[PDB]
């Protein structure tokens, strides 16, 4: 009844959810063959939320994977925990999306959306009803943000009242791969705002900063970054899979975070985070952990939180701890940061407790804070886009493939509107 | 395979060494003539190359086996005295085996056999373990980079392993 | 599934690809008889049991070099029917290579094109390897492209043109061939990679430090820079870039698709014993005017868009650090209509080398690919070269006697002039 | 083509380990207390 | 392909799996209810 | 992290720098190739599999001093094109080496400077090496200081110039070269110290009892001064002293940035037998005018600032006791505006000997550098020597022929007389 169907759009989604299904498999005690293990009855009593029974005692993930290139999804199949998914869940592309929001969305993507909505509706309707979806994608890539946003748009009119909860990788400011960034980022937010219920903002260079300073590593690969964000992405949905003192599902996180129906971009954090040389002399308690929450060195988005007046906040702790150590310290953040939490909303922050921790942790947390501090994120995407647009280049393909002037200006005026209510509610 | 016999290698101080002695050392064959004017202009540069790079060294790095193109015992020993490294005696069967093996002879071609090219004097052929040409140092070739091609020696990847 | 068809015209084209397909079969480990002692399918088709057939076609009008490949070392891997021999050379004439003697070869070559592309679905691109100065390289080189734009009008025709040096051109009617084929090459190609002879001559003198290159030593470097371009096609990497993506992030207007390349490191064995091949310095070593493939100084130019793809065990962290190093540099002055200018391609495959060639090995090879406004000068010296020879209609009686009437010399003047002014109006 | 047996040039390995904030430093006599340590504490003759 | 153990474990993110774990005497579950 | 790039121009700096890196390689335990069986990071870089390379460039305009090193024993130590050499010697000409022949090599000399500076962030600066006796060291050396200053602003430029000996200078056109080589050396180098050859000569008689040694025996003594100067930043110490400390503790005013040097003890295998070498007496042997290595006698001058670096089993209370007896020493007179005039530095290691050299195993040593008012006399006699050249225009046609006009010599006279007036007013 409380079902989450996973969608992994593009090369971003397939590999960012490859690590999520890895960290949720061994948390739920599942070997790479598919059958059950893991010596705890907590993880079997709620196992359907991410898995389906394959009539052999084997649990298969409820994941559908988007791509138009079979290269990187052949690699996840060869990799561990890649044979968990049934082969009918994948969809093959042959033309390949060229990191172009026009190419992914309109012209050849329509020949695969008929072939993948018919499998995601069979996965969804197999249960009595479902609590929502999670969708993982980027905004600088076209196979992730073309089929990613278009799958969001049609599931809105398919299922009109069940939530969509998307983890979005945003264009990093300083470094910039795949140089047509603003034609993808601006032209995907402008339909994410009215067709997605929750959007969580993840920056690449902020993941770079928090693993190089705070988590204190020299040069890991990209696969170490995916393990960082998928650990917090698992902790967000800990209540749907495990019991707690204070139950809070994803729609509980919805109502307590979004005040007005149009702004739904959230900050996502994880704690505790420390290095190998910094493990044994540190304290593990709710006092120091809530202080580790509230700084730019923990934030997975490269928007400085000190420049933004916090609208709402939330913290889902995991493990065995006392509630007063949660909420006197959670109040202690409010009265110490007097100017940092918006005044017309008293008690801006909410907490929730999962009784189980993640494996190898005792008290962990995820921080879903709807801070207003994303003026800086949205205004420099629009400053890059308005430098792209006053001149008419990297755009004659978009006109030749079937658009016109009015839909770029619609997205630019909509993204200018994204900035607009942020400071005037600040 | 065993490229050389037990009593073929021949160095300074007049003693024989076996084939396992070349283990882990960069091995090269010096097809050269005693009176040849190419060899007069090139031998001092091989002497300095052999000097500095293994004397300022942590292990033995280079062996050069002279294999001679000369005409006389007395002319062989006269060129021998000006040269310290390894060598092969002229009138063993070995000189004319590695001559046709590595294509290094001296326009005496038709009175012996009907093949084509000769790639004669001078040449250094750094070689691998199994008697294979490892890479060519171009003194007199299409590059014709004489007196300088010694810097093109690839000593890390050519070992007698 | 995945495939690309390589076309070679002219003597430059045949021997460039003579080093490219040598380096390709060296990568996959196949013996060059066609026998191996699933990733190779983009360059080779499987014909029977263990037999590999290349996806290449060899074209010229003069049979002294197609028959040299046929009788050469690669007689059996190169199946004897991919090569085509002509009757007589175009003889440094666009008019001969396109109008008179090209009609007897273009019919056979196109009958090969659609019977090599109908084998499997998912055709991806074409690698056209032509010499602009040569008569059959620009003549039959031109004639193949409009016919390829008629039948395969919705596909990519990527090109590799060896532009002449300002001083080294080795032909007298060479600037006549360059002006009169570029306009017809313009709206029939979609990606153009311009190299140079004297530029790579300067490279071989400076950092690979041979005093003594030749055309095959030119061909080692160009076969390496094409292979790094196709590295993410054949094999696996983190951020794979394909043929449909080189134009996605370099060509802003349909007119401006001419573009430079380079490579780093280009070193010898003694040149690798002593220095960092670090990510933070290879990008610096691939951006100087003493490193690109066209001897075109960009210090008075303005960088516009660039793919910087890697190959080897390399992490995108110090790649990201090297990107910010370039952006903070003041000498490499990027344009103001795009603050973003980079792509960082990346692939895990170690840089292959040819045993025998002087290009030593490394675990990181970097091809720099760059579109820039510096092309205005390399085509302007090409323009005043033509204007001095066209003062009293020199060498034009050969062309009008072949059937190419007087008058389509002349719009080639203002079409290249219209292209030259396009660089100024995009850089303002 | 079998001339591929070769140790790879340009010898860097990409440092996967922890970066060296603290390199082994010789702590010796002048930054070595003793002396007054047993003079303030009289560890007996 | 550089298939060595340290590189392949680095691409597989095992380093973060090691150091997000807490390396002490951790699992504290006693049942305080008495009969 | 900590980085310094030793740049050498002129052949004097070539085998001074050869003694520098043979002492650095021997001290750090690395091989003549470079494989040794963070500590080395300031001079060598980790480049290879357990292999290191120097961070230096050798810049001379003529081949016989560079290529003989490239064919010597240290041919696999250096990166082989860091040792850049010109085509023709400047031949005692500032005019040729600064205006007409310097540009043929300085475009590629700067080109290699910013490989080594880019390799790490955190340069303290550059170890400049030259002699102002010749034409490459004066001319090409001086041109290097304007371009290093305009490219790199706030980095230290710490110059070791081999100042000519006063009474003899093994040259005839010497007073022309140096008085305008120090023209732009005033405003472009930062921490410069005089090194007179004849002072190194007569300390070899008195201390080492050696009567016929060569230039390289001087270079052993110079290289020990190099090592002792930067071993506080190289290895750990009780009072470490960086390059930015040498600005701090030496120079009073930005114009008067010339100092002197001394290195005590300098004893042989006869005096190390019979003498005790405590700190309390080697400091007296370092401050004595006879051990001065510039032939600037401090007895008729006022000491302004003094720096000392100690290497070995030195205790800081012996530093305090030795400097206490120096303050009470009445002939060593310190200027009235600097009541406290000492910097001291501590390092643990003893100095490392070159085997077969003329030094002995000494536990503790002193490297002293002092800015003194008395050093105006080596420019006062140099002013007089230029006057009887320039009285009726000796050798003027050589320098006017390739770049300057008549008037740059008198314009060099103006700031050298301004130097003498600045030294006179501060010594009041
Ligand atoms: N980069 C490069 N250019 C080459 C090479 N070989 C020839 N060229 C160029 O090709 C131009 C002339 O064309 P050619 O290759 O000589 O002959 P072609 O292409 O068959 O055309 P024709 O002259 O009619 O025979 C010359 O200006 C050369 O610059 C090569 O190996 N590498
Ligand atoms: N301390 C020291 N001084 C040297 C050495 N070699 C030469 N000199 C001095 O350098 C002065 C002349 O400069 P040189 O280095 O010989 O010549 P240069 O400066 O390189 O100018 P060019 O000869 O034109 O290249 C002479 O007065 C020598 O006293 C040396 O090895 N050590
Ligand atoms: N998930 C993921 N993101 C990337 C990768 N490389 C770059 N990015 C970031 O995502 C954007 C590029 O989109 P990407 O996901 O790589 O392209 P896609 O394959 O079409 O989805 C850039 O702004 C980068 O900051 C990658 O390999 N995986
Ligand atoms: Mg031909
Ligand atoms: Mg000289």
PDB file of N, CA, C and O and ligand atoms in Angstrom, chain A residues 9-16 67 69 72 97-100 137-146 169-172 175-178 181 184 203-205 222 226, chain C residues 237-240 245 316 320 344 346 348, ligand 3:
ATOM      1  N   UNK A   9      16.732   7.977 -14.458  1.00  0.00           N
ATOM      2  CA  UNK A   9      16.820   8.557 -15.782  1.00  0.00           C
ATOM      3  C   UNK A   9      18.221   8.878 -16.259  1.00  0.00           C
ATOM      4  O   UNK A   9      18.941   9.654 -15.625  1.00  0.00           O
ATOM      5  N   UNK A  10      18.613   8.289 -17.383  1.00  0.00           N
ATOM      6  CA  UNK A  10      19.873   8.623 -18.017  1.00  0.00           C
ATOM      7  C   UNK A  10      21.066   7.996 -17.322  1.00  0.00           C
ATOM      8  O   UNK A  10      20.948   7.203 -16.391  1.00  0.00           O
ATOM      9  N   UNK A  11      22.253   8.376 -17.808  1.00  0.00           N
ATOM     10  CA  UNK A  11      23.497   7.893 -17.214  1.00  0.00           C
ATOM     11  C   UNK A  11      23.679   8.439 -15.804  1.00  0.00           C
ATOM     12  O   UNK A  11      24.343   7.815 -14.968  1.00  0.00           O
ATOM     13  N   UNK A  12      23.104   9.609 -15.524  1.00  0.00           N
ATOM     14  CA  UNK A  12      23.085  10.099 -14.153  1.00  0.00           C
ATOM     15  C   UNK A  12      22.277   9.182 -13.253  1.00  0.00           C
ATOM     16  O   UNK A  12      22.776   8.708 -12.228  1.00  0.00           O
ATOM     17  N   UNK A  13      21.034   8.898 -13.646  1.00  0.00           N
ATOM     18  CA  UNK A  13      20.143   8.146 -12.779  1.00  0.00           C
ATOM     19  C   UNK A  13      20.573   6.708 -12.579  1.00  0.00           C
ATOM     20  O   UNK A  13      20.455   6.169 -11.474  1.00  0.00           O
ATOM     21  N   UNK A  14      21.074   6.070 -13.640  1.00  0.00           N
ATOM     22  CA  UNK A  14      21.414   4.651 -13.581  1.00  0.00           C
ATOM     23  C   UNK A  14      22.546   4.389 -12.596  1.00  0.00           C
ATOM     24  O   UNK A  14      22.521   3.403 -11.855  1.00  0.00           O
ATOM     25  N   UNK A  15      23.547   5.268 -12.572  1.00  0.00           N
ATOM     26  CA  UNK A  15      24.682   5.087 -11.676  1.00  0.00           C
ATOM     27  C   UNK A  15      24.463   5.699 -10.300  1.00  0.00           C
ATOM     28  O   UNK A  15      25.101   5.255  -9.340  1.00  0.00           O
ATOM     29  N   UNK A  16      23.586   6.695 -10.168  1.00  0.00           N
ATOM     30  CA  UNK A  16      23.317   7.240  -8.843  1.00  0.00           C
ATOM     31  C   UNK A  16      22.350   6.335  -8.087  1.00  0.00           C
ATOM     32  O   UNK A  16      22.343   6.337  -6.847  1.00  0.00           O
ATOM     33  N   UNK A  67      17.533   5.149 -20.500  1.00  0.00           N
ATOM     34  CA  UNK A  67      18.721   5.543 -21.255  1.00  0.00           C
ATOM     35  C   UNK A  67      18.428   5.389 -22.739  1.00  0.00           C
ATOM     36  O   UNK A  67      17.564   4.598 -23.131  1.00  0.00           O
ATOM     37  N   UNK A  69      21.440   5.020 -24.561  1.00  0.00           N
ATOM     38  CA  UNK A  69      22.706   4.399 -24.923  1.00  0.00           C
ATOM     39  C   UNK A  69      22.875   3.133 -24.098  1.00  0.00           C
ATOM     40  O   UNK A  69      22.808   3.194 -22.859  1.00  0.00           O
ATOM     41  N   UNK A  72      26.388   2.351 -20.665  1.00  0.00           N
ATOM     42  CA  UNK A  72      26.571   2.435 -19.221  1.00  0.00           C
ATOM     43  C   UNK A  72      25.586   1.558 -18.462  1.00  0.00           C
ATOM     44  O   UNK A  72      25.782   1.317 -17.265  1.00  0.00           O
ATOM     45  N   UNK A  97      20.718  10.056 -26.900  1.00  0.00           N
ATOM     46  CA  UNK A  97      20.446  11.465 -26.654  1.00  0.00           C
ATOM     47  C   UNK A  97      21.759  12.223 -26.541  1.00  0.00           C
ATOM     48  O   UNK A  97      22.677  11.791 -25.836  1.00  0.00           O
ATOM     49  N   UNK A  98      21.852  13.345 -27.240  1.00  0.00           N
ATOM     50  CA  UNK A  98      23.099  14.071 -27.298  1.00  0.00           C
ATOM     51  C   UNK A  98      23.257  15.210 -26.311  1.00  0.00           C
ATOM     52  O   UNK A  98      23.600  16.318 -26.733  1.00  0.00           O
ATOM     53  N   UNK A  99      23.003  14.965 -25.016  1.00  0.00           N
ATOM     54  CA  UNK A  99      23.009  16.000 -23.963  1.00  0.00           C
ATOM     55  C   UNK A  99      22.237  17.252 -24.375  1.00  0.00           C
ATOM     56  O   UNK A  99      22.589  18.376 -24.015  1.00  0.00           O
ATOM     57  N   UNK A 100      21.177  17.039 -25.144  1.00  0.00           N
ATOM     58  CA  UNK A 100      20.368  18.088 -25.737  1.00  0.00           C
ATOM     59  C   UNK A 100      18.967  17.918 -25.183  1.00  0.00           C
ATOM     60  O   UNK A 100      18.391  16.829 -25.279  1.00  0.00           O
ATOM     61  N   UNK A 137      17.896  11.942 -11.552  1.00  0.00           N
ATOM     62  CA  UNK A 137      18.299  12.478 -12.845  1.00  0.00           C
ATOM     63  C   UNK A 137      19.218  13.676 -12.637  1.00  0.00           C
ATOM     64  O   UNK A 137      19.397  14.160 -11.518  1.00  0.00           O
ATOM     65  N   UNK A 138      19.797  14.145 -13.741  1.00  0.00           N
ATOM     66  CA  UNK A 138      20.614  15.350 -13.777  1.00  0.00           C
ATOM     67  C   UNK A 138      19.891  16.450 -14.543  1.00  0.00           C
ATOM     68  O   UNK A 138      18.768  16.278 -15.023  1.00  0.00           O
ATOM     69  N   UNK A 139      20.561  17.596 -14.655  1.00  0.00           N
ATOM     70  CA  UNK A 139      20.060  18.740 -15.406  1.00  0.00           C
ATOM     71  C   UNK A 139      21.104  19.306 -16.357  1.00  0.00           C
ATOM     72  O   UNK A 139      20.872  20.363 -16.954  1.00  0.00           O
ATOM     73  N   UNK A 140      22.246  18.643 -16.503  1.00  0.00           N
ATOM     74  CA  UNK A 140      23.235  19.053 -17.475  1.00  0.00           C
ATOM     75  C   UNK A 140      23.349  18.036 -18.587  1.00  0.00           C
ATOM     76  O   UNK A 140      24.116  18.213 -19.537  1.00  0.00           O
ATOM     77  N   UNK A 141      22.583  16.962 -18.468  1.00  0.00           N
ATOM     78  CA  UNK A 141      22.613  15.876 -19.434  1.00  0.00           C
ATOM     79  C   UNK A 141      21.250  15.624 -20.047  1.00  0.00           C
ATOM     80  O   UNK A 141      20.233  15.720 -19.366  1.00  0.00           O
ATOM     81  N   UNK A 142      21.247  15.266 -21.331  1.00  0.00           N
ATOM     82  CA  UNK A 142      20.000  15.218 -22.079  1.00  0.00           C
ATOM     83  C   UNK A 142      19.303  13.872 -22.007  1.00  0.00           C
ATOM     84  O   UNK A 142      18.079  13.791 -22.128  1.00  0.00           O
ATOM     85  N   UNK A 143      20.069  12.790 -21.846  1.00  0.00           N
ATOM     86  CA  UNK A 143      19.406  11.508 -21.647  1.00  0.00           C
ATOM     87  C   UNK A 143      18.860  11.369 -20.235  1.00  0.00           C
ATOM     88  O   UNK A 143      18.023  10.494 -19.990  1.00  0.00           O
ATOM     89  N   UNK A 144      19.296  12.220 -19.311  1.00  0.00           N
ATOM     90  CA  UNK A 144      18.781  12.210 -17.961  1.00  0.00           C
ATOM     91  C   UNK A 144      17.710  13.252 -17.718  1.00  0.00           C
ATOM     92  O   UNK A 144      16.824  13.045 -16.888  1.00  0.00           O
ATOM     93  N   UNK A 145      17.766  14.372 -18.438  1.00  0.00           N
ATOM     94  CA  UNK A 145      16.815  15.456 -18.242  1.00  0.00           C
ATOM     95  C   UNK A 145      15.829  15.591 -19.393  1.00  0.00           C
ATOM     96  O   UNK A 145      14.937  16.443 -19.335  1.00  0.00           O
ATOM     97  N   UNK A 146      15.946  14.770 -20.428  1.00  0.00           N
ATOM     98  CA  UNK A 146      14.957  14.773 -21.486  1.00  0.00           C
ATOM     99  C   UNK A 146      13.864  13.769 -21.199  1.00  0.00           C
ATOM    100  O   UNK A 146      12.683  14.117 -21.150  1.00  0.00           O
ATOM    101  N   UNK A 169      20.414  16.511  -9.943  1.00  0.00           N
ATOM    102  CA  UNK A 169      21.794  16.977  -9.977  1.00  0.00           C
ATOM    103  C   UNK A 169      21.839  18.238 -10.830  1.00  0.00           C
ATOM    104  O   UNK A 169      21.510  18.207 -12.018  1.00  0.00           O
ATOM    105  N   UNK A 170      22.228  19.313 -10.245  1.00  0.00           N
ATOM    106  CA  UNK A 170      22.277  20.633 -10.848  1.00  0.00           C
ATOM    107  C   UNK A 170      23.643  20.919 -11.460  1.00  0.00           C
ATOM    108  O   UNK A 170      24.645  20.310 -11.073  1.00  0.00           O
ATOM    109  N   UNK A 171      23.679  21.811 -12.452  1.00  0.00           N
ATOM    110  CA  UNK A 171      24.963  22.263 -13.008  1.00  0.00           C
ATOM    111  C   UNK A 171      25.827  22.928 -11.949  1.00  0.00           C
ATOM    112  O   UNK A 171      25.413  23.889 -11.296  1.00  0.00           O
ATOM    113  N   UNK A 172      27.035  22.404 -11.782  1.00  0.00           N
ATOM    114  CA  UNK A 172      27.977  23.005 -10.858  1.00  0.00           C
ATOM    115  C   UNK A 172      28.500  24.329 -11.419  1.00  0.00           C
ATOM    116  O   UNK A 172      28.750  24.448 -12.622  1.00  0.00           O
ATOM    117  N   UNK A 175      33.310  24.447 -12.262  1.00  0.00           N
ATOM    118  CA  UNK A 175      33.618  23.546 -13.364  1.00  0.00           C
ATOM    119  C   UNK A 175      32.349  23.334 -14.181  1.00  0.00           C
ATOM    120  O   UNK A 175      31.232  23.413 -13.663  1.00  0.00           O
ATOM    121  N   UNK A 176      32.510  23.114 -15.485  1.00  0.00           N
ATOM    122  CA  UNK A 176      31.350  22.942 -16.355  1.00  0.00           C
ATOM    123  C   UNK A 176      31.715  21.975 -17.478  1.00  0.00           C
ATOM    124  O   UNK A 176      32.396  22.350 -18.437  1.00  0.00           O
ATOM    125  N   UNK A 177      31.280  20.728 -17.333  1.00  0.00           N
ATOM    126  CA  UNK A 177      31.266  19.795 -18.444  1.00  0.00           C
ATOM    127  C   UNK A 177      30.035  20.072 -19.297  1.00  0.00           C
ATOM    128  O   UNK A 177      29.128  20.793 -18.875  1.00  0.00           O
ATOM    129  N   UNK A 178      30.014  19.491 -20.503  1.00  0.00           N
ATOM    130  CA  UNK A 178      28.851  19.445 -21.405  1.00  0.00           C
ATOM    131  C   UNK A 178      28.243  20.840 -21.591  1.00  0.00           C
ATOM    132  O   UNK A 178      27.197  21.170 -21.032  1.00  0.00           O
ATOM    133  N   UNK A 181      24.867  23.742 -20.857  1.00  0.00           N
ATOM    134  CA  UNK A 181      24.206  23.676 -19.560  1.00  0.00           C
ATOM    135  C   UNK A 181      22.907  24.474 -19.464  1.00  0.00           C
ATOM    136  O   UNK A 181      21.882  23.884 -19.103  1.00  0.00           O
ATOM    137  N   UNK A 184      19.613  23.309 -20.906  1.00  0.00           N
ATOM    138  CA  UNK A 184      19.026  22.128 -20.300  1.00  0.00           C
ATOM    139  C   UNK A 184      18.465  22.452 -18.921  1.00  0.00           C
ATOM    140  O   UNK A 184      17.332  22.071 -18.612  1.00  0.00           O
ATOM    141  N   UNK A 203      24.398  19.364  -5.799  1.00  0.00           N
ATOM    142  CA  UNK A 203      25.416  19.984  -6.637  1.00  0.00           C
ATOM    143  C   UNK A 203      26.649  19.095  -6.687  1.00  0.00           C
ATOM    144  O   UNK A 203      27.019  18.486  -5.679  1.00  0.00           O
ATOM    145  N   UNK A 204      27.279  19.025  -7.861  1.00  0.00           N
ATOM    146  CA  UNK A 204      28.458  18.179  -8.020  1.00  0.00           C
ATOM    147  C   UNK A 204      29.661  18.749  -7.278  1.00  0.00           C
ATOM    148  O   UNK A 204      30.368  18.021  -6.574  1.00  0.00           O
ATOM    149  N   UNK A 205      29.915  20.054  -7.426  1.00  0.00           N
ATOM    150  CA  UNK A 205      31.095  20.636  -6.799  1.00  0.00           C
ATOM    151  C   UNK A 205      30.927  20.793  -5.296  1.00  0.00           C
ATOM    152  O   UNK A 205      31.925  20.956  -4.588  1.00  0.00           O
ATOM    153  N   UNK A 222      34.300   8.943  -8.735  1.00  0.00           N
ATOM    154  CA  UNK A 222      32.919   9.391  -8.662  1.00  0.00           C
ATOM    155  C   UNK A 222      32.088   8.417  -7.830  1.00  0.00           C
ATOM    156  O   UNK A 222      31.117   8.823  -7.185  1.00  0.00           O
ATOM    157  N   UNK A 226      28.767   8.924  -5.015  1.00  0.00           N
ATOM    158  CA  UNK A 226      27.429   8.349  -5.088  1.00  0.00           C
ATOM    159  C   UNK A 226      27.066   7.638  -3.793  1.00  0.00           C
ATOM    160  O   UNK A 226      25.896   7.611  -3.401  1.00  0.00           O
TER     161      UNK A 226
ATOM    162  N   UNK C 237      34.089   4.167 -20.774  1.00  0.00           N
ATOM    163  CA  UNK C 237      34.625   5.253 -19.978  1.00  0.00           C
ATOM    164  C   UNK C 237      33.554   5.793 -19.055  1.00  0.00           C
ATOM    165  O   UNK C 237      32.413   5.327 -19.053  1.00  0.00           O
ATOM    166  N   UNK C 238      33.937   6.792 -18.257  1.00  0.00           N
ATOM    167  CA  UNK C 238      32.996   7.384 -17.312  1.00  0.00           C
ATOM    168  C   UNK C 238      32.005   8.297 -18.023  1.00  0.00           C
ATOM    169  O   UNK C 238      30.790   8.076 -17.973  1.00  0.00           O
ATOM    170  N   UNK C 239      32.505   9.331 -18.692  1.00  0.00           N
ATOM    171  CA  UNK C 239      31.676  10.237 -19.484  1.00  0.00           C
ATOM    172  C   UNK C 239      32.031   9.962 -20.942  1.00  0.00           C
ATOM    173  O   UNK C 239      32.988  10.517 -21.483  1.00  0.00           O
ATOM    174  N   UNK C 240      31.266   9.076 -21.568  1.00  0.00           N
ATOM    175  CA  UNK C 240      31.538   8.711 -22.949  1.00  0.00           C
ATOM    176  C   UNK C 240      30.953   9.752 -23.894  1.00  0.00           C
ATOM    177  O   UNK C 240      29.808  10.183 -23.740  1.00  0.00           O
ATOM    178  N   UNK C 245      28.036  13.967 -30.659  1.00  0.00           N
ATOM    179  CA  UNK C 245      28.291  14.920 -29.592  1.00  0.00           C
ATOM    180  C   UNK C 245      29.456  15.869 -29.839  1.00  0.00           C
ATOM    181  O   UNK C 245      29.542  16.907 -29.171  1.00  0.00           O
ATOM    182  N   UNK C 316      38.027  12.638 -12.471  1.00  0.00           N
ATOM    183  CA  UNK C 316      37.547  13.992 -12.772  1.00  0.00           C
ATOM    184  C   UNK C 316      37.736  15.011 -11.658  1.00  0.00           C
ATOM    185  O   UNK C 316      37.173  16.103 -11.754  1.00  0.00           O
ATOM    186  N   UNK C 320      38.795  18.721 -12.774  1.00  0.00           N
ATOM    187  CA  UNK C 320      38.046  19.918 -12.399  1.00  0.00           C
ATOM    188  C   UNK C 320      38.972  21.016 -11.899  1.00  0.00           C
ATOM    189  O   UNK C 320      38.705  22.205 -12.105  1.00  0.00           O
ATOM    190  N   UNK C 344      34.704  18.064 -20.487  1.00  0.00           N
ATOM    191  CA  UNK C 344      35.772  17.154 -20.100  1.00  0.00           C
ATOM    192  C   UNK C 344      35.306  15.725 -20.335  1.00  0.00           C
ATOM    193  O   UNK C 344      34.674  15.119 -19.464  1.00  0.00           O
ATOM    194  N   UNK C 346      36.161  11.726 -20.748  1.00  0.00           N
ATOM    195  CA  UNK C 346      37.014  10.883 -19.923  1.00  0.00           C
ATOM    196  C   UNK C 346      36.756   9.424 -20.271  1.00  0.00           C
ATOM    197  O   UNK C 346      35.623   9.037 -20.574  1.00  0.00           O
ATOM    198  N   UNK C 348      38.656   5.233 -19.558  1.00  0.00           N
ATOM    199  CA  UNK C 348      39.600   4.507 -18.715  1.00  0.00           C
ATOM    200  C   UNK C 348      40.717   3.811 -19.480  1.00  0.00           C
ATOM    201  O   UNK C 348      41.647   3.304 -18.844  1.00  0.00           O
TER     202      UNK C 348
HETATM  203  N1  LIG G   3      25.716  11.472 -12.801  1.00  0.00           N
HETATM  204  C1  LIG G   3      26.744  11.981 -13.504  1.00  0.00           C
HETATM  205  N2  LIG G   3      26.839  13.327 -13.618  1.00  0.00           N
HETATM  206  C2  LIG G   3      27.855  13.883 -14.309  1.00  0.00           C
HETATM  207  C3  LIG G   3      28.851  13.004 -14.933  1.00  0.00           C
HETATM  208  N3  LIG G   3      29.737  13.804 -15.548  1.00  0.00           N
HETATM  209  C4  LIG G   3      29.340  15.085 -15.341  1.00  0.00           C
HETATM  210  N4  LIG G   3      28.228  15.129 -14.585  1.00  0.00           N
HETATM  211  C5  LIG G   3      27.499  16.351 -14.179  1.00  0.00           C
HETATM  212  O1  LIG G   3      26.251  16.317 -14.868  1.00  0.00           O
HETATM  213  C6  LIG G   3      26.219  17.253 -15.939  1.00  0.00           C
HETATM  214  C7  LIG G   3      26.315  16.455 -17.230  1.00  0.00           C
HETATM  215  O2  LIG G   3      25.204  15.569 -17.334  1.00  0.00           O
HETATM  216  P1  LIG G   3      25.426  13.977 -17.422  1.00  0.00           P
HETATM  217  O3  LIG G   3      24.647  13.274 -16.338  1.00  0.00           O
HETATM  218  O4  LIG G   3      26.893  13.652 -17.299  1.00  0.00           O
HETATM  219  O5  LIG G   3      24.909  13.617 -18.904  1.00  0.00           O
HETATM  220  P2  LIG G   3      23.812  12.494 -19.263  1.00  0.00           P
HETATM  221  O6  LIG G   3      24.502  11.183 -19.533  1.00  0.00           O
HETATM  222  O7  LIG G   3      23.125  12.914 -20.536  1.00  0.00           O
HETATM  223  O8  LIG G   3      22.761  12.353 -18.190  1.00  0.00           O
HETATM  224  C8  LIG G   3      27.416  18.175 -15.776  1.00  0.00           C
HETATM  225  O9  LIG G   3      26.980  19.485 -15.403  1.00  0.00           O
HETATM  226  C9  LIG G   3      28.256  17.576 -14.665  1.00  0.00           C
HETATM  227  O10 LIG G   3      28.414  18.524 -13.607  1.00  0.00           O
HETATM  228  C10 LIG G   3      28.675  11.546 -14.762  1.00  0.00           C
HETATM  229  O11 LIG G   3      29.479  10.733 -15.264  1.00  0.00           O
HETATM  230  N5  LIG G   3      27.619  11.129 -14.061  1.00  0.00           N
END
